[PDB]
Structures are given as structure tokens and as C-alpha cells.
Write a protein that holds these residues in place. Sequence first.
Motif: not given
Ligand code: BCR
Lengths: 171, 30, 252, 137, 33, 34, 97, 334, 37, 244, 36
Positions: H7, H33, H104
Motif C-alpha cells: 500500500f 468533499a 464545510l
Molecule cells: C480510500 C483511499 C483513497 C481514496 C479516497 C476517496 C476517493 C475518497 C472520496 C471521498 C468523497 C467523494 C467524499 C465526498 C464527500 C461529500 C460531501 C461531504 C458533500 C456534502 C454535501 C452536502 C451535505 C450538500 C447538502 C445540500 C446542499 C449544499 C444544497 C442543496 C440541499 C442539500 C441538502 C443536498 C486515496 C486515493 C486517498 C488513498 C488512501 C485510501
Amino acid sequence: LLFFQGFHNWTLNPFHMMGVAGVLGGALLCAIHGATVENTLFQDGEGASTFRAFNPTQAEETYSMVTANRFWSQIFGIAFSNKRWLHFFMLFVPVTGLWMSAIGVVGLALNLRSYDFISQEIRAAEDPEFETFYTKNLLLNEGIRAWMAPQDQPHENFVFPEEVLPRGNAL
Amino acid sequence: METITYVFIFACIIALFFFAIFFREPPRIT
Amino acid sequence: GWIVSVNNLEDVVGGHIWIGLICIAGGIWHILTTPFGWARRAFIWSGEAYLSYSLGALSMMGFIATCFVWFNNTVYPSEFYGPTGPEASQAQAMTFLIRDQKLGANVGSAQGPTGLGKYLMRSPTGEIIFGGETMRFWDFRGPWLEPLRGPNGLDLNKIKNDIQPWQERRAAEYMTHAPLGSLNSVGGVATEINSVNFVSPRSWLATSHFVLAFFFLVGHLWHAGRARAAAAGFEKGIDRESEPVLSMPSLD
Amino acid sequence: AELTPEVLTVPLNSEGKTITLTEKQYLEGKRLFQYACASCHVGGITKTNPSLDLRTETLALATPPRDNIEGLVDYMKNPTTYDGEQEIAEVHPSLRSADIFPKMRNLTEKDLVAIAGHILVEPKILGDKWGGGKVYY
Amino acid sequence: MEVNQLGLIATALFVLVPSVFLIILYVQTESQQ
Amino acid sequence: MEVNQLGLIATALFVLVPSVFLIILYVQTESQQK
Amino acid sequence: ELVNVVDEKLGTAYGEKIDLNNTNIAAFIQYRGLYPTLAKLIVKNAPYESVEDVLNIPGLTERQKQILRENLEHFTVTEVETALVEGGDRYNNGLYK
Amino acid sequence: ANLWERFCNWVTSTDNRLYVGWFGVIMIPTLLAATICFVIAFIAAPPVDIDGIREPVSGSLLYGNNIITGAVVPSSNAIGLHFYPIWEAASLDEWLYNGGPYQLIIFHFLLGASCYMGRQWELSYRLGMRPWICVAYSAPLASAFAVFLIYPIGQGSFSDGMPLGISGTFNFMIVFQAEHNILMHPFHQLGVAGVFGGALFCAMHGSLVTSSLIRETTETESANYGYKFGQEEETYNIVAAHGYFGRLIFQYASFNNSRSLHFFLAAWPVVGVWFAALGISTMAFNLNGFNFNHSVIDAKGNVINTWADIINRANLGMEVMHERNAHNFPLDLA
Amino acid sequence: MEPNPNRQPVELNRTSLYLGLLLILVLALLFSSYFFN
Amino acid sequence: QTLTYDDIVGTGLANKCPTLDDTARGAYPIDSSQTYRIARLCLQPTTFLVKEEPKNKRQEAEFVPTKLVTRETTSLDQIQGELKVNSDGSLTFVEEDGIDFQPVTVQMAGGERIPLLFTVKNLVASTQPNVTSITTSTDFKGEFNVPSYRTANFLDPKGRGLASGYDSAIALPQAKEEELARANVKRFSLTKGQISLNVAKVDGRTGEIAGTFESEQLSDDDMGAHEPHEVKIQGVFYASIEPA
Amino acid sequence: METLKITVYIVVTFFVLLFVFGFLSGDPARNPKRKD
Ligand SMILES: CC1=C(/C=C/C(C)=C/C=C/C(C)=C/C=C/C=C(C)/C=C/C=C(C)/C=C/C2=C(C)CCCC2(C)C)C(C)(C)CCC1
Ligand code: CLA
Ligand code: CLA
Ligand code: CLA
Ligand SMILES: CC(C)=CCC/C(C)=C/CC/C(C)=C/CC/C(C)=C/CC/C(C)=C/CC/C(C)=C/CC/C(C)=C/CC/C(C)=C/CC/C(C)=C/CC1=CC(=O)C(C)=C(C)C1=O
Ligand SMILES: CCCCCCCCCCCCCCCC(=O)OC[C@H](COP(=O)(O)OC[C@@H](O)CO)OC(=O)CCCCCCCCCCCCCCC
Ligand code: HEM
Ligand SMILES: CC1=C(/C=C/C(C)=C/C=C/C(C)=C/C=C/C=C(C)/C=C/C=C(C)/C=C/C2=C(C)CCCC2(C)C)C(C)(C)CCC1
Ligand SMILES: CCCCCCCCCCCCO[C@@H]1O[C@H](CO)[C@@H](O[C@H]2O[C@H](CO)[C@@H](O)[C@H](O)[C@H]2O)[C@H](O)[C@H]1O
Ligand SMILES: CCCCCCCCCCCCO[C@@H]1O[C@H](CO)[C@@H](O[C@H]2O[C@H](CO)[C@@H](O)[C@H](O)[C@H]2O)[C@H](O)[C@H]1O
Ligand SMILES: CCCCCCCS[C@@H]1O[C@H](CO)[C@@H](O)[C@H](O)[C@H]1O
Ligand code: OEX
Ligand SMILES: [Ca+2]
Ligand SMILES: [Cl-]
Ligand SMILES: [Cl-]
Ligand SMILES: [Fe+2]
């Protein structure tokens, strides 16, 4: 600058936005290419300070295009492979940006602005709950114009009584 | 219609990134 | 607020008792031992590497010191350093609550233009807090405000009846020494006129330490990357006859 | 335009007597007003209570009248609300409260006069800016 | 929203016309000897 | 006249898309080694 | 027709004098002797059917009544306007300098 | 090899089309994200109460924005600097109302972009390169930290972080001008010198290298064909370029050492941009631009305006109008 | 690695381009009235 | 026994009314010669229901459930006022002051957000006649005032307001004004609400009572730009009665 | 919400453990030149 914001909303103008992209894009290219060459250098001297290991008249590239290319291909996804193209692009980008901003300023000579989105205004006029950052910045513009015009444009002899000045609560 | 247009152009640009990276002309020492 | 929240000298002194013993025990430890196998394999062992580790650490300490002087009013007493930014904003709300209540306002039931209380409102967990923009600063705590706090936050009975002249004075002092001011030390908001020569020691100390912490992170990266390369033997550039990429397979 | 003896001539009392301050008293008055008062009263307004300013017309309608040296000097010893009704030394800098406003500990009678004369001369120079706030900046 | 009714066709041809120009030139490059 | 507001882009794309498909095919046939 | 009630109030005596039933309390700074002591009593005991009723507020000293008589010509009363008295607005109407 | 070993070998492999690496194991999921949440919020998020005054601002395309007006809107001033993950909200609908997507996004982004920087060091080490590309990237990175994290910390709220959107960016700039007079601040001035100068030097270097390409092609072909990837010989004549530029100005103002030149190209924009980032990060603690308001006074004491006073009037316009329902007290102290 | 042996070149001669364009344009000329309705 | 601010802060408990033991089923004597007050009235809403508005107008609209989006910021508390003993032995509470309103936004199925000024401003509430003790059979019913959810300085996103702001749609300088009058001319609403307080618990010894309430009032009308909705709020209450 | 929380906590801990163990796994040796 602040006059163009308050009166022309010049930030909203796509020709100024292309200017910005070519200035910041050119500064990006300047930084990334200088750093890339300095970090893919061939060891050409014994010194830990590497500037002396170059000779103006030398035939050979001072840094490895192949290693640079692999590095950016793997970090960013693409990379230059052609040095003539690379350097042409460095001319193209900031030069093109500046020429675009100039075109927008030619429109502003005539007050031909990108001041408004008509759809936005029609909606906001009928709907007092509809608000975007675009409507917020026009409120700022209206403050700039009312607060700065009497001193900035003395030939107009503006007198704006306290009671007409646009202000929000408290301030 | 406008939202569809904006999202459509964006999705094309994302597709373009995919091809420009994984289906690039490979650089060749030659 | 992590360690920056420390709010009483018993905790401060106790922490240094711990830290003094930890550091003496640790020091004896390191005199009596040599680094273990897993540490040997994790680090670079050179003067430049050690410098890098310390630059990293000083950078971290710099950012922490910045936040300590910005928010903490216990080991940075507001008597000496001036009010914190949160403190002075709260002191403004307190000032006008006192003013308008003296004039007859009922400050608990006064609804502001947005529908939220003009002087008093609830935090997202319900505690009674000052209103207006200082809603953001309701975690502020200070000796001149605390006598007004009850189990549920600011107490309306205490506000109506118990506010002493020394609290009015201190809130007025702190409101008018908020840590805002220009680089040439003109005190106040950026549109204020010349007259008051003031920049809070809290702003001087936070900004300087941010700048220092930032450049020390840079020096950490510079030296850590250099120590790695020097140790592996390619800090002066790529050997033209042994260019590593040339023995690697194509990416495509 | 100049800072003339006439600009520097201001009412001494409510009974029509004036005093002509010297250029040095004017400078001392600016300096001392900055030192002890401008944190709340920059530019002639009042930050902790913007309803009351240091404009001369405002001072005239205060009780007792404050639009003269004697009224201002007395204000700095024993400040009152605008109607004369309450003594506010406990919350406003004054000689009587130099104990809780330590900046007032060094102020001499001559210093109070200089600050008074500053309050009266400045609007003669600055017009509506004095006590105007940001609108007039 | 009350947008300009022509913005859709303006945008569509603004993309399509030059994009198709490029694809035409690209493909006939690939098909060369 | 109150026409369908999508007729314009429908007709334009109806024409453009398959025409461009044929022009692409034609031009790269001509450019082939021949 | 929809009416802005504040603009409309400006064309009555509210636009000419201190309206004991509506005017914000800083307006009493305009005249000698009214602020803050009487201003507070007046707002606190409002509304008044007529200006003279201001003389009937309990606890007033003789000097205070006399100050009130001297200032009646600067006072008016009009119907209470909800938009002007809600929000604690007679005490703080969001206007500073 | 065992599983772990294999790995590790794959993670750190120099042969993966995109390098993964240990920084990449944190970078990949955090950036995914941040990207996914941003895309969905930008298209479909409902209005967000940015200023905590129950006045929700619409950022998304489906709620009436276009690409220029749209944004992911900062979290509520009621939240301040409190950490507001999805699981702190009673419901997604509440989370959306209060601007949870902003937190976020910016937290995953700042973590992932910091790992992007580490990953640049990491790959340069695997390839036997010098290590400081990542130090160049620390300049835009530090600027992103300034506007999304340090400024909110100083002011006490993520509601004062830069919005994720084109118009919201301009909103953040104009308000920043009102509150700090950034234009009159020397660290922003160094920033401008850094990016205008980066652009100037970018174009200059481009044009000089392009001007001196050695003839290798005919007029019916792109001169780019004159260079082949990996060739050993330099593709332009540095001596002709210097011969040109040293005469344009004067000999000693031109670089004859390519390593020196390239270092300058790296350093000029990077250092200026570090100062820009530091301007934002120190105005975060309200040490603001130069204030010459009423600095010039005549013999009587009349104010004689300068251009600084005209700036001041524009700034006042911004200040009094911004967040027009949010202030109840006379001073805007954060 | 090794190239795909199943690939073929594709052709469209000029006459077919003209036939095809005629089809598309005439179909557009026919259907456009219904598209606008 | 007793919690400090540090024990409470950030738990949610600050938005909760005090409760009484299941043991509290007593009777609090009213001496008709004595004057009384409520020293603390607290109302903790637990449900907001909004009356849907049909196209049908055939069949009655129901009150539907909604999701609170403004967090634990909903309760009314520290309210006080006189508790009068009337000549027929009924009690009348006359609200005087306190934290007697909270802006609240709740969201209906499908996304419509309904802001309201949840309130008992100027509450005048009365029991049945002859209430010689307050017991678990006492209830109070009365009316209160619901002022505009925004006050007169509030400026819409185009800068328009009642006591401040532009008086027209300045972005559409030559639009016909008539179609925009409702958005341009702000109006300040003032309507009545109704509430029932149902005692479920009484501590005879301390003068404390707790129960359930239900109130009905209009929501925000955006300074006259649209029709308000009807809201029904249900929750728990606490009061401390005192001789005064 | 409680399940979401626990899930994210486990996810984050997972990746963080990868980062820390990974860099502990003889990182200085993974370079093209001097491995010792
Ligand atoms: C396993 C592994 C890997 C790969 C990783 C990956 C490819 C992950 C993916 C991850 C992902 C792909 C994540 C995503 C997350 C997402 C999120 C956390 C989103 C949230 C969003 C939200 C919560 C929204 C809400 C709303 C708005 C803003 C307006 C309209 C209404 C509603 C409520 C729908 C690497 C090559 C570094 C190497 C070591 C082991
Ligand atoms: C991200 C922030 C950003 C960025 C990167 C830009 C970038 C740009 N801006 Mg924009 N701007 C911004 C934010 C930004 N702006 C904002 C928020 C506003 C508020 C609306 C503006 C308002 C604004 C205005 C009002 C203008 C710009 C312009 C420009 C362009 C300037 C190009 C230039 O170098 O002119 C510099 C000047 C030249 C290149 C002319 C030639 C100079 C010669 C060669 C100088 C020789 C000097 C000599 C040797 C001696 C000097 C001696 C010494 C003592 C000084 C460029 C595209 C300008 C533009 O669009 O112009 C078309 C412009 O007018 N901006
Ligand atoms: C300047 C202070 C200092 C420095 C530079 C060192 C340096 C060293 N120590 Mg000593 N040590 C010290 C003080 C110090 N020590 C003190 C005060 C004590 C007594 C508590 C010790 C007790 C000690 C022991 C018992 C051991 C060392 C070991 C080592 C070696 C490996 C360290 C390592 O891998 O850390 C990196 C840390 C880890 C790998 C732990 C996991 C990393 C997690 C993820 C860090 C989480 C924190 C995070 C960054 C956030 C900060 C806030 C947090 C508290 C929540 C190295 C020579 C080892 C050794 O070889 O002894 C010969 C060893 O076994 N030290
Ligand atoms: C590399 C993977 C990764 C990382 C680092 C993060 C990180 C984050 N997530 Mg994201 N997330 C991920 C993948 C990740 N996510 C994936 C794949 C999903 C889809 C299921 C999500 C879905 C998700 C949601 C829905 C949310 C988050 C949120 C968060 C934030 C809070 C996390 C937390 O409370 O952990 C707490 C856990 C720990 C502190 C465990 C650490 C234990 C070790 C053993 C101790 C050492 C750590 C110490 C601090 C020092 C660092 C070591 C260093 C020196 C090397 C933070 C920005 C929340 C948010 O953004 O709030 C605004 C939020 O709502 N995440
Ligand atoms: C859900 C939805 C819809 C989301 C979208 C929301 C949203 C807000 C989207 C954004 C919209 C958007 C993109 C707006 C911006 C639009 C805008 C202003 C565009 C400008 C357009 C334009 C034509 C401007 C004119 C000026 C101009 C030409 C600018 C170009 C700028 C540009 C592309 C610069 C280069 C940038 C860049 C990252 C280059 C990398 C180069 C590279 C691989 C270097 C590495 C490298 C270095 C070496 O040295 C060597 C040796 C080698 C080998 C090597 O490899
Ligand atoms: C961690 C992994 C990160 C993955 C990131 C995803 C990155 C995508 C990068 C760009 C791919 C598309 C490139 C097409 C074009 C392409 O394939 O270029 C490939 C090209 C290769 O250059 P060569 O030197 O090999 O080619 C020259 C000869 O062919 C001359 O013709 O690279 C450049 O020209 C570098 C400069 C352009 C740099 C453009 C960068 C633009 C950034 C994106 C901006 C748009 C944002 C829109 C947002 C809505
Ligand atoms: C020695 C320095 C000072 C002087 C000469 C001074 C002078 C005055 C004067 C003459 C007035 C009455 C205004 C009028 O009648 O129109 C006044 C009121 C006031 N000043 Fe000052 N002041 C000083 C320091 C301060 C400071 C430092 C503060 C802020 C902490 C302050 C806050 C106030 C307030 C709140 C009022 C209104 C008080 C009331 O009537 O209730 N003053 N000041
Ligand atoms: C005095 C005082 C106190 C106390 C204090 C204390 C008790 C402290 C402690 C402290 C501590 C106890 C700390 C710790 C730290 C740690 C750290 C900082 C870590 C680091 C780490 C690292 C850096 C690692 C690295 C790495 C990795 C991760 C992977 C592999 C590779 C390497 C090895 C490179 C208080 C607050 C109470 C109050 C106030 C006063
Ligand atoms: C918006 C609407 C867009 C519609 C898009 C339609 C796109 C259609 C793509 C057609 C692709 C034709 O694909 C192309 O086929 C030719 C031959 O025909 C291949 O070419 C191959 O054969 C020719 C002829 O023997 C050789 O000279 C050439 O060297 C060889 O590569 C190309 O390498 C390939 O790119
Ligand atoms: C926040 C939670 C994390 C805190 C953990 C800190 C504890 C510190 C002690 C950990 C000891 C780890 O010890 C370390 O383990 C790894 C994984 O098997 C070993 O194994 C590694 O060795 C070689 C090094 O050339 C690698 O090529 C190989 O892939 C790998 O198996 C290291 O050589 C060993 O020294
Ligand atoms: C795949 C994720 C798609 C994003 C989903 C958007 C939220 S769901 C969306 O919510 C609206 C507002 O409540 C509703 O009016 C609408 O009926 C509903 O489909
Ligand atoms: O939130 Mn966004 O902006 Ca920073 O200042 Mn205060 O708070 Mn609000 O006013 Mn100005
Ligand atoms: Ca019952
Ligand atoms: Cl704003
Ligand atoms: Cl406020
Ligand atoms: Fe180059």
C-alpha cells in the motif's frame, strides 16, 4: 478606483474581469515558471549556492524540461512540454488581459457600463425578500456616490442635506 | 433555461479537464 | 478556544507546575536515552533539519501567541493591554443599553429593526446575550460584565437594578479604546479624523506575531525541504548523467 | 485666513465679558483636549452619547449655560446632565472624580481654562464640522 | 426571472460555432497521412 | 405573433448539429492521404 | 391607496413641533431644561389628549411645571403612530450623528 | 511484501498518472468533499442568513442567481467562530438556513490546499528535484487562509469570511476598504507591485525568450515545432536576449544569468503576494491603512482636503450603507 | 500498449455532404413552422 | 443543587422553562385583600403549526407541522406583571415587561419559510371567576399585540423602508410606479393574538405554577408586501406568583 | 445526526492514521538517490 466602483460598478464588467484574470494569471505564470526552473536545475557546479553554475554562452538547458513536465503532469494533471509555447503563453496572457481591460474602459468613457442585471432588478423591485450579493454591492455604490460626489465633483455645487443621505441603521 | 445553460457549460468544462488530463497527447522525448 | 480560554490564575499556575515537571523529567529522559528505532527512521538527522523542526514549532507558537493576545484577558489583563476586540464591542452594547434604559427604555422587550432584540437577544443555545452585531461576541467574559450574568446569561433583573457606576465607566472606557486604528496610530475606525493617537497593544502584538509566525512557517518549509534534499544528496540540482525521471516509465 | 486675536476671543461668562486667548493657550487647549477628552469627544461629538455634542449653540442651551469659559470650567469640576438636574462625576471625567478618572489628576486650573477655550474656539474655525460627525468629515 | 429571451441562442451559438470550427480542424488534422 | 419561444433554438440546433457532423466527416475525408 | 404613515405624519404638527405622543426623546434637547429628566417623564406618561395634560404628571416639582409651561408652545400632540413608538423607538430611533 | 508495505509503495509510487503520496491521502478526500458540497450548494442551496439578522441572502443558481451574482454564502453571524458541522444542526434545513455549507467547504478546502502544498514538496523529493515549488505556492495559499480563516478569526465571525462567489468577492473587497482603508496600506501596495510586476515580468520574459528563438522552422509552420520535448540544447539565444534588453535599458539592468533571472521571476510575485496575504492577515486585527484624514490644515485651522480626504468620503459611503439593518450602535467595532 | 486492429477510416464524399445538407436544410425548412407553432 | 452559567452555557437548557416535580399538585391561596404579581413568566414553544392556504376554499385549511430553522432562540422569559384579583374573584395578568418576543423562522414541507414574531406583548390574560386558589384546574385566557415583525427603520434589499430608505424602485427609473406601489410603500402591521395557559402543576408553598399553552397569531407580512400566515404555537410555561 | 457524526469521526481517524503511519514508514528512504 473607488469612483469606478461607485459610479460604473466596474468590478461587474466582464472586460475588467478578463483584465484581472490576465494580470493575476500572468503573476501566477511568472511565479510558477521561475520556481519550476529554479527547482529542476541540473547540478552544474559544486557550490550549494547554484547561481554560479550557469554560463551565458552554454549550449545546454540549465534545468530539466523532462523532470519539470513529469512533476506538473503528476501534481496538476497537465504540464508544458514545449518551451517555445510556454514562453509565448507568458507573453499572451497578461498582454491579452490588459487589452481586454482597455476595451471595457473605452465603454466606460461613454458610461456604457455593465452596471446591472435587468432580471435581478425586476425581481428585486417586486420582491422585497429577494437579496443577492449583486443587490448588496449596488447599495454600497449608492453610498459611495452620495457621500463622495459633493467634494469629489466641486463644479456641480452639490448640496445634499443630511436627511437625503443614504445610510443604514445607526451608522 | 438559464440555470441549465450555466450548469451545462460548467459540466462541459469538467469533461474537458478529464480528456485534457487522461486523454492528452503524450509528451515524447524525440 | 483551546488553551486560549484559560481564565483563572489557579489554572495558569498549575499548568506551569505541570509544564515545569514535564520539562525537567523530559530533559532527564533525553540525557539518559538515545533516540529509538522508529524515531531514527522517521527523521532527518542534520543541523538544517533540526533548525526546520524548531522553525515549525516557533511558527505554531507565534500563531498561538497571536490568538492569546487577541482574545485572552486573564494573562493579558485589559487594564494593561486595553480591551479585546470582543470586549470593546460588547462594551458598546452595554453602554447604550445603560444610556437608553436611564432614559426609560425597557431593554428586555425593545425589538430592533430586524425583529431581534435591539439590546438583548438569545444565542443559538438560548443564553441571553447583547444584540446587534456583537451577537458574534457572546462568548466574551470579563470582570465588569460578569456581575450581570445569571445561570441563563445576561439577567434582566440585574440589568434593570444592579448596574454600578464603575461598570458604566469601564464599558465606556473599553468601547472608546477598541483595538481599531491606523498604521500611523490614528485611533478608531478607518474613516475617523485625526485627533486620537492610539493603536491598541493587542493589535500591535497580534499583527507582529502573525507576520513572524507566517514567515517562520515559510522558513520551516524552506529548511525542511532543503534538509531532505541535502540528506538525499540532490540539493544542488539533478545529476545530468543520473536524472531519476529518465529511468522511470512514461506516464502515458 | 489666520488664527487671529478675534478668533481667539471667546465669552468668559454669561454676563458679556470676553477673554482673548493667546496662541500658546490655543495650542495647549488642543493638546489637553486630545489628552483627556478626545477619546469620547473627537471632532466635537460625544461617542458614548451622540445626542449631546460640544457645539456652542448646544452648550448655550445647557443648564447651567456652558457656552462660556466659566460654565465649561465648572463642567470639568462638577459635570451635570444637560438640564442641571444630576451630578454625573461618577461616570464623567472631572476634578471631583480625579480619583476614578486618573487623567484628571494632573489637570490644573490653567489647563481647564485652555480646554474650555479649545471647545469654544474650534467651531469658530471648523463651523459645522465641529459636532457634525462623519457627515461633515 | 425576466431574462433576455435571446440569451439562450446567443450563448448556444457562442459556444457551438467556434467549438465546431476547432473540432473540424482537429479531426481533419488527425486524418492526415 | 405569439410563437413558441424555443422554436428559434430548436430550429438552429436541428440545422447546426447534423450539418456540423457532416462537415466534420467531409473535411477529414478530403484531408486523408489521397 | 397605500400610504407611508411617517411621511404623512410629517405634514401634521408632528412635522413642526415636539409631539409628546410620538416624537423620539432626543428632540427635547432642542430646548433648555427638558432633557433628560422631563423628557423621560414625558415619554413615560404619554399619550396625552392635549399638550396641557403634560402638567398633570405625578411627582413634578414646581420648577419642573414652570419649565413645562414655558415650553408648551413647542409641543403638540397627534394620534399615536404605531410605526414611531414600537421598537422602543422613542428612546432609540437608530439615529446617532 | 505485506499488505501495508505494498500500500505504501503504491501511495508513494512515482508511476501513478497523478501522484498520490501521504499528503494526497488527506488532500483527495477533503478536496472532493469541498468540491462536491460547493457544486451542489452553488446550484441548489436556499438563502442563507449571513448577518444573523433573519435576512437570508440568496446565493444559488436555482434561487435566482447567475454565475456572476451566485455564491456559497458565509455562515451566520449568530454562529460567529463556533464550529457548525452538519451534526450540530437539528436538521439539514436548519443547517442550510445558517450557512453550514460554507464552513464545510472552506474547512475541507483549506486542509486540502495545505496538503496540496505538502504534496508538491513530497513529489519533488520522490523525483530528486529541489524542493521549493511548494514555497511559491505558499503565497496564494497564505492569501486563501487570510480571507477564509484569519480575517474571520480577528473579526470574530466566519460571516466576515470572503464569500465563495464572484459578486460576493467584490462585496468583501468594498467592505474591507470601508473598514481598513486597505488601498492606503503598504502591504496591499506591495501586493499590487507584486501582481502588476509579476504580470509585467511575465510578459517581459515571454517576449524576450520568444524574440530570440533560434530559427528551426519554415514560415508555413509554427515556430513551436522548432523545439522538441527533452532536447539538450537551449532553444533561444540568451546572449541575443540580454544583448537586446541590456540595450533597451542599460547593460547592468539586464540579467545575463538564467538562474538569477528565473529566481527573480519566482521571488518578485511570491514576496509581493506574501505581503498581500499579510496585509489581509494583519488588518484582521485592525491595524489599518494610513489615515491622513484632515492631515493638511491652513494657518487659521481650516481643513484643506487632499486626495486622502476624497478617499475618505468614498469609504464613508461604503461604511454607512453596508449591512444596512445589522448595526444598532454608532460604531462598527468588528 | 499494442494498437487496436479493429480501427477503420471513415469517409463522406462531397456528393454525400451535399445530399446530407439538403436533407437537413429541407427537413428544417419543413419542421421549423411546427417548432415555432 | 443549583446550576451556574458555566453549567448551562451551550447545553440548550437556557432556552428551556423551569419544570415542577410530578409531586406539585397543590393549591396556591389567593387572599383577595392582597396584591400580587407574576415575577417570572416563561414560555417555551415546542411546536409551531402553520395554517396551509388552499386554492380550494371548499373544505377548511389545516394547521400543518413545520421545521424550526433558527435554533434554540424561541422562548419568552423573564416576563413580569401585575396579577389583579377582580371583583368576581377572577385573576387578570397584565404583562408589563420582559423578553416578551422572539423572531422565529419555521419552514414548511417543500421549503417555504415562515418568519413570525412569536410574542405575548401587552398580554392581558384572565382566569375563570371565583379563583380562591390557583390549582391544576385554573387556566388563563387572553389577548396580546403582534406588531410588525420588522420595525420602521428596516430597509429592504433595494434600500426601501418606512421611516428610512428610498420611496421608489430607483433601479427602474422610468418604470410605471403603480404596479410597484405595494413593494414601494411600506406598511407597519399591528394585529391581535390569543393565548390559553393551562395549569398542570402548582407548588402551593412556593407560588410556582407550570403548564401547557397554545397561542394563535399572524406571521410576518414583510411590511405589507404579502399576506401573513396564521400560526399556532404550542408549548410549556412556568410562572412564579408573588405577593407584591 | 449522531450516526453521521460517528461516521465522519471514524472516516477522519482512518485517513489521519494513514497519514501518520505512512510518513512513519521509512519516508526518508523513498527518494531516488541516498536511502540511508
Ligand atoms: C480510500 C483511499 C483513497 C481514496 C479516497 C476517496 C476517493 C475518497 C472520496 C471521498 C468523497 C467523494 C467524499 C465526498 C464527500 C461529500 C460531501 C461531504 C458533500 C456534502 C454535501 C452536502 C451535505 C450538500 C447538502 C445540500 C446542499 C449544499 C444544497 C442543496 C440541499 C442539500 C441538502 C443536498 C486515496 C486515493 C486517498 C488513498 C488512501 C485510501
Ligand atoms: C484582484 C484585484 C485586481 C486586479 C488584479 C486588477 C487588475 C487591473 N485593473 Mg482593476 N480594480 C480592482 C481590482 C483589481 N484590478 C477593483 C476592486 C476596482 C474597483 C472598481 C478596480 C478599478 C480599476 C480601474 C478604475 C482601473 C483598473 C485597471 C486594471 C488594469 C491595470 C493594468 C495596469 O497595470 O495599468 C497600469 C498603467 C499602465 C500599464 C499604463 C502604462 C504605464 C507606463 C509604462 C509607466 C512608465 C512609468 C515610468 C517608467 C516612470 C515612473 C516613475 C515613478 C516615480 C513612478 C488591470 C487589468 C485599469 C484598467 O482597466 O485600464 C484599462 C483601470 O483604469 N481597475
Ligand atoms: C522541545 C521539546 C522536545 C523535542 C524537540 C523532543 C524530541 C524527541 N523526543 Mg522527547 N520529550 C519531551 C520534549 C521533547 N522531545 C518532554 C518534555 C518529554 C516528557 C513528556 C519527552 C518524552 C519523550 C519520550 C517518552 C520519547 C521522546 C522521543 C523523542 C524523539 C522523537 C519525537 C517524535 O517522534 O515526536 C512526534 C510525536 C509523535 C510521533 C506522537 C504522535 C503525533 C500526534 C499526531 C501529534 C498530536 C499533536 C498535534 C500536532 C496537535 C498539538 C496539540 C495536542 C496536544 C492536542 C525526539 C528526539 C522518543 C525517543 O526516541 O526517546 C529517546 C520517545 O519515545 N520524548
Ligand atoms: C482525509 C479525510 C477527511 C478529513 C481530514 C476531513 C476533515 C473534516 N471533516 Mg470531512 N469527510 C470526509 C473526509 C475527511 N474530512 C469524507 C470522505 C466524508 C464523506 C462521508 C466527509 C464528510 C464530512 C461531513 C458531512 C462533515 C465533515 C466535517 C469535517 C471537519 C471536522 C472533522 C471532525 O470533527 O473530526 C474529529 C476527529 C478527530 C479530531 C480524530 C483525530 C484522532 C487522531 C488519532 C488524533 C490526532 C489528530 C490531531 C488533531 C492532530 C493532527 C495530527 C497532525 C500533527 C499530523 C474537518 C474539516 C464537518 C464540517 O465540515 O464541519 C464544518 C462536517 O459537517 N466531513
Ligand atoms: C456549479 C457551477 C456552475 C460552478 C461554477 C461557479 C464559478 C464561480 C465558476 C467560475 C467562473 C469562471 C472561471 C470565471 C472566470 C472567467 C474569466 C474572468 C476568464 C478570463 C478569460 C480570458 C480570455 C481572459 C483574458 C486574459 C487571459 C488570456 C487569461 C488566461 C489566464 C491563464 C489560464 C493562466 C495560466 C493559469 C495556469 C494555472 C497555468 C498552469 C501552467 C503550468 C502547467 C505550469 C507548470 C510548469 C511550469 C514551468 O515552468 C515548466 C518548465 C513546466 C514544464 C510546467 O509544466
Ligand atoms: C490533484 C489533482 C488536481 C486535478 C485538477 C484539475 C485540473 C484541470 C487543469 C486544466 C485542464 C484543462 C486544460 C486544457 C488545455 C490543455 O490541455 O493544456 C495542455 C497544454 C500542454 O502544453 P504543451 O507545452 O504540451 O503544448 C504546446 C504545443 O502543443 C503547442 O501547440 O498545457 C498548457 O498549455 C499550459 C497552460 C494552459 C493552462 C490552462 C490552465 C487552466 C486552469 C483551469 C481554468 C478554468 C476554470 C473553469 C472553472 C469553471
Ligand atoms: C476633560 C475632558 C472632557 C471635557 C472638557 C468634556 C466636556 C463635556 C461637556 C462640556 C459636555 C456637555 C455637552 C453639552 O452640554 O452639550 C459633556 C458631556 C458628555 N461627555 Fe464629556 N468631556 C470630557 C471627557 C469625556 C470623556 C472621556 C467621555 C467618555 C468616556 C465623555 C463623555 C460624555 C458624555 C456621555 C456626555 C453627556 C453626559 C450627560 O449629559 O448625560 N466626556 N462633556
Ligand atoms: C502552562 C499552561 C497550561 C498547560 C499547558 C500544557 C500542559 C501544555 C502541554 C502541551 C503539550 C503536551 C504539547 C504537545 C505537542 C505535540 C506536538 C506539537 C506533536 C508534534 C508532532 C509532529 C511534528 C509529528 C510529525 C511527524 C508525523 C506526524 C508523521 C511521521 C513523521 C513526523 C515524525 C515528521 C494551561 C493550558 C493548563 C493553562 C495555561 C498555562
Ligand atoms: C456538436 C456536434 C458535433 C458532432 C461531433 C462529431 C465528431 C465525429 C468524429 C469523427 C472522427 C473521425 O475520426 C478520424 O478518423 C480518421 C480516418 O477517418 C483517422 O485517421 C486515420 O486514417 C487516415 C486515412 O487513412 C490516415 O491518413 C490517418 O493518419 C489515420 O489516423 C483519425 O485518426 C480519426 O480522428
Ligand atoms: C495520532 C495517532 C498516531 C500516534 C502514533 C505514534 C507512535 C510512535 C511509534 C510508532 C512506531 C512505528 O514504527 C514504524 O512502523 C512502520 C510500519 O510498519 C515501519 O515499517 C516500514 O519500514 C520501511 C522503512 O524503510 C518501509 O519501507 C515499509 O513500508 C514499512 O513496513 C517503520 O520502519 C517503523 O519504524
Ligand atoms: C442530488 C441532490 C439534489 C439537491 C436537492 C435539493 C434539495 S430537495 C428540494 O428542496 C426544495 C426546497 O425545500 C423543494 O421545494 C423541492 O421540492 C425539493 O426537490
Ligand atoms: O458583518 Mn460583515 O462587516 Ca465586519 O464591520 Mn461590523 O461586522 Mn458587519 O459591519 Mn462592518
Ligand atoms: Ca389543568
Ligand atoms: Cl454589505
Ligand atoms: Cl451593533
Ligand atoms: Fe524561462
